[PDB]
Design a protein around this motif. Structure first.
Motif, short mmCIF file in Angstrom:
data_model
loop_
_atom_site.label_atom_id
_atom_site.label_comp_id
_atom_site.label_asym_id
_atom_site.label_seq_id
_atom_site.Cartn_x
_atom_site.Cartn_y
_atom_site.Cartn_z
N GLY A 181 2.38 -7.75 6.46
CA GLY A 181 3.67 -7.20 6.13
C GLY A 181 3.65 -6.46 4.80
O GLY A 181 2.62 -5.91 4.40
N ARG A 182 4.80 -6.45 4.12
CA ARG A 182 4.94 -5.75 2.85
C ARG A 182 4.82 -6.67 1.65
O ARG A 182 5.44 -7.73 1.60
N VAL A 183 4.00 -6.25 0.69
CA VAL A 183 3.78 -7.04 -0.52
C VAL A 183 4.37 -6.30 -1.71
O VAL A 183 4.20 -5.10 -1.86
N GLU A 228 0.27 -1.46 -2.12
CA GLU A 228 0.14 -0.60 -0.95
C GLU A 228 -1.08 -0.86 -0.09
O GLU A 228 -1.08 -0.55 1.10
N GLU A 229 -2.13 -1.41 -0.68
CA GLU A 229 -3.31 -1.71 0.12
C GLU A 229 -2.95 -2.90 0.99
O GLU A 229 -3.08 -2.85 2.21
N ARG A 237 -7.76 -12.67 -0.27
CA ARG A 237 -9.15 -12.24 -0.27
C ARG A 237 -9.28 -10.74 -0.51
O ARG A 237 -10.15 -10.31 -1.27
N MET A 238 -8.44 -9.95 0.14
CA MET A 238 -8.51 -8.50 -0.03
C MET A 238 -8.03 -8.13 -1.43
O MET A 238 -8.58 -7.24 -2.07
N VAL A 241 1.68 -9.68 -6.47
CA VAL A 241 0.31 -9.43 -6.90
C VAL A 241 0.18 -9.68 -8.39
O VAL A 241 -0.88 -10.07 -8.87
N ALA A 242 1.26 -9.46 -9.13
CA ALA A 242 1.22 -9.69 -10.57
C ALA A 242 0.96 -11.17 -10.80
O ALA A 242 0.04 -11.54 -11.54
N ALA A 243 1.77 -12.00 -10.17
CA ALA A 243 1.64 -13.44 -10.31
C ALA A 243 0.25 -13.93 -9.90
O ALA A 243 -0.42 -14.64 -10.65
#
Length: 729
Positions: free
Chosen positions: A17-19, A9-10, A57-58, A24-26
């Protein structure tokens, strides 16, 4: 595990766009597995699903922060359990705690506490009174207090007993989680920030004449204003405070109500009612208020800084990718006044050839003599460029640099302007002092002023990022925060430009993904010992160089006139085979390489897909042999190049020239580049921040910088934009 989630969500709040939590797990699996961001954003997009740097980076930062949140979350669990109070419910609250603030709130009742007067009152058995009265408001305070008086225990008078028992409740109420969460959320959506001057410091610091008096809605305050206020406050001039409605003469404070409701404390008219009302007020005015203020202010500050540091991030990024003008001879001029202007002539290789310090401006005034000296130096070394610092007195030095170039036309010099950012910090540095133990500090700065014009990237990596002053109050900002961020851009930039392992200074190498202050010097070692690297392949023979390391830096290092031609391409050795198994349509002739749209064009993907690579692993490969190791940096233009643009033919998608608005409509603005055709500039790409109507922003007669986004020679049209963000792509 629930961390991928909070990160999703961040990330999903950015233009990108949408992640998906899975992505993020990978990515996190790669990081802990020692990979570098620049590496993933480049050679693993598949395992992530084309996630870019800005995203990574974020993720990387929110990643670090959340894990701290988790480490501290355990210490609390441990602490509370060791105390014999880790309830299942409390345990669940702790797990669910989103912020580090809610996490610390929940710990309050159990945090190690000092000898507050409430503990004294407790020990004197005034804990019973505290519960009796609160539990039953019909009791009669003062009367029931009489029962607990005791001179020896520190409660001689009835009034004492009651006061003591007040702190018992004050302390309980001021540590309630649910409450602190409520009052905080409330104070942040309703309260309004307020700034005032201290009686006396009025004249003393009139620097804050725009805030010596101010009042605005906290829920939305601008970074600058906020930073200004704390700036003056901290400086010892201003006084900040939050307020809700007016505290009048004598009204019920909004929060004093919420505090009561939370404990079902109503004021009918019972005996305790008045006393209980007193403890509710004190809880707020002596405890809960300063707490919330601190929590909130420090939240605004924490927010104001983000922004500022985000702007600083952009500034540096733009400077790092300034266009490299060299390898030519340059004369660095670090303007100055009282202490004269330093001079430094570097050669087309970076090698310092001469230094000097002249006093053309005030106080001394040796304008003509200065001119004579420079001339001499510009001739003596066949100087071609004249970098000038954008600092103090640059105005007159550019005037002086003019007199010059128009007195010795035979020299063909060209004056350029450059940032002095870091020039000083660098001069005082140890790296600089180790290369020029001879030159005085004031002169080491002029060497940087010169070397950067040639190649901004190379010279700037030699300065502590957080010190290349690009912003205004950059010093006032959190250093660790600012640091770890500016370091990020640097890493991002040099890996985005590649590095010729065969000439790069140990400084530049340390910034390549997977390399430190160590393996860097180490690379130089071989270079210095075994001559020159012929292929990335030979980087394996380096002292400490390891498999994970190689794999992590090989793609960004770059051998130029090597053997394997594919070592001048962003192409990782990881795919050398995928590139070779292109024997089909055997254009192996010098390899299809640079074979532009000639065959190389498209060549429909799906070509290669073994289980590993396959697409943006290879359909970026195809965009590479086409133009191997291309420089993401802008082509170099002089200071008057534009004076050379007259036709529509003298333009290529990319240029950023100056223009004048001749018309402003409600669907954009037409601009004159001096090409005898006007350029349309859509309201949209007219600015960076959204535009309601062109009439407010720009107006006819206005001069602005624009980027030629597209050229149609047949229709005779010009696409333009006042924003350097987007590209003519």
């Amino acid at each position: 595990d629930s961390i991928n989630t909070r990160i999703a969500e961040e990330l999903s709040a950015l233009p990108s766009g949408r992640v998906q939590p899975q992505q993020v797990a990978a990515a996190v699996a790669l990081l802990d597995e020692g990979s570098t961001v620049p590496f993933i954003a480049r050679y693993r997009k598949e395992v992530t699903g084309s996630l870019d740097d800005t995203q990574l980076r974020m993720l990387e930062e929110r990643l670090r922060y959340l894990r701290e949140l988790e480490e501290r979350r355990g210490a609390i669990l441990a602490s509370i359990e060791e105390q014999g109070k880790l309830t299942p419910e409390l345990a669940r609250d702790i797990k669910l705690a989103d912020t580090k603030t809610r996490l610390e709130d929940l710990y309050l009742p159990y945090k190690q506490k000092r000898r507050t007067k409430g503990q004294i009152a407790l020990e004197a058995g005034l804990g019973a009174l505290a519960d009796a009265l609160f539990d039953d408001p019909t009791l009669v305070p003062e009367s029931e207090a009489a029962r607990f008086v005791d001179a020896e225990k520190g409660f001689a008078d009835v009034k004492a007993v009651l006061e003591g028992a007040k702190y018992i409740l004050m302390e309980r109420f001021a540590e309630d989680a649910t409450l602190l969460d409520k009052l905080r959320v409330f104070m942040k959506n309703e309260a309004t920030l307020t700034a005032r001057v201290v009686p006396g410091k009025e004249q003393e610091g009139a620097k804050f004449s725009d805030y010596f008096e101010h009042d605005e809605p906290l829920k939305s305050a601008p970074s600058h204003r906020a930073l200004a206020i704390f700036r003056g406050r901290n400086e010892g001039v201003l006084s900040a405070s939050l307020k809700v409605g007016e505290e009048a003469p004598g009204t019920l404070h909004p929060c004093e109500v919420m505090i009561a409701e939370r404990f079902g404390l109503s004021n009918q008219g019972r005996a305790a009612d008045k006393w209980l009302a007193e403890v509710v007020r004190w809880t707020w005015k002596v405890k809960l208020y300063t707490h919330l203020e601190t929590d909130l202010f420090g939240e605004l500050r924490d927010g104001a800084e983000d922004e500022a540091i985000s702007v600083f991030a952009r500034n540096l990024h733009d400077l790092l990718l300034a266009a490299p003008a060299g390898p030519r001879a340059t004369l660095g001029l670090d303007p100055g006044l009282r202490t004269g202007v330093k001079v430094a002539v570097v050669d087309a290789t970076g090698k310092l050839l001469d230094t000097a310090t002249v006093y053309p401006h005030a106080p001394k005034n040796q304008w003509d003599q200065t001119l004579a000296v420079l001339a001499a130096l510009c001739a003596k070394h066949q100087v071609e460029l004249i970098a000038i610092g954008n600092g103090t007195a640059s105005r007159e030095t550019d005037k002086l640099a003019g007199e010059l170039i128009k007195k010795y036309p035979g020299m063909k010099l060209t004056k350029i302007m450059v940032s002095e950012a870091g020039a000083s910090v660098y001069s005082a540095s140890e790296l600089a002092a180790k290369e020029f133990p001879e030159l005085d500090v004031s002169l080491r700065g002029a060497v940087s002023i010169a070397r950067r014009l040639q190649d901004p990237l190379a010279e700037l990596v030699k300065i502590e990022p957080k010190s290349i002053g690009v912003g205004q109050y950059q010093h006032d900002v959190s250093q660790l925060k600012l640091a770890r961020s500016l370091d990020a851009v640097v890493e991002d930039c040099v890996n985005a430009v590649g590095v010729d392992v065969n000439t790069a200074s140990a400084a530049l190498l340390a910034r390549i993904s997977g390399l430190n202050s160590t393996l860097a010097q180490n690379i130089v070692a071989h270079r210095d010992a075994n001559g020159a690297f012929r292929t990335r392949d030979e980087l394996k023979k380096v002292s400490r160089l390891g498999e994970k390391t190689f794999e992590q830096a090989a793609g960004f290092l770059r051998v130029m006139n090597g053997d394997n031609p594919l070592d001048a391409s962003a192409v990782h050795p990881e795919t050398y085979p995928l590139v070779q198994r292109i024997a089909a349509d055997t254009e192996r002739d010098i390899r299809s390489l640079i074979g532009d749209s000639a065959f190389l064009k498209r060549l429909d993907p799906k070509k290669f897909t073994d289980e590993t690579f396959g697409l943006p692993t290879v359909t970026d490969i195809l965009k590479e042999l086409d133009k191997p190791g291309r420089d993401p940096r802008p082509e170099f233009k002089t200071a008057e190049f534009q004076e050379g643009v007259e036709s529509l033919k003298d333009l290529k998608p990319g240029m950023v020239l100056e223009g004048v608005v001749t018309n402003v409509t409600n669907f954009g603005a037409f601009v004159d580049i001096g090409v005898h055709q006007d350029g349309l500039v859509h309201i949209s790409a007219l600015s960076e921040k959204f535009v309601k109507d062109p009439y407010e922003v720009v107006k006819a007669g206005d001069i602005v910088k624009v980027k030629v986004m597209e050229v149609d020679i047949p229709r005779n049209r010009v696409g333009l934009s006042m924003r350097m963000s987007d590209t003519p792509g």
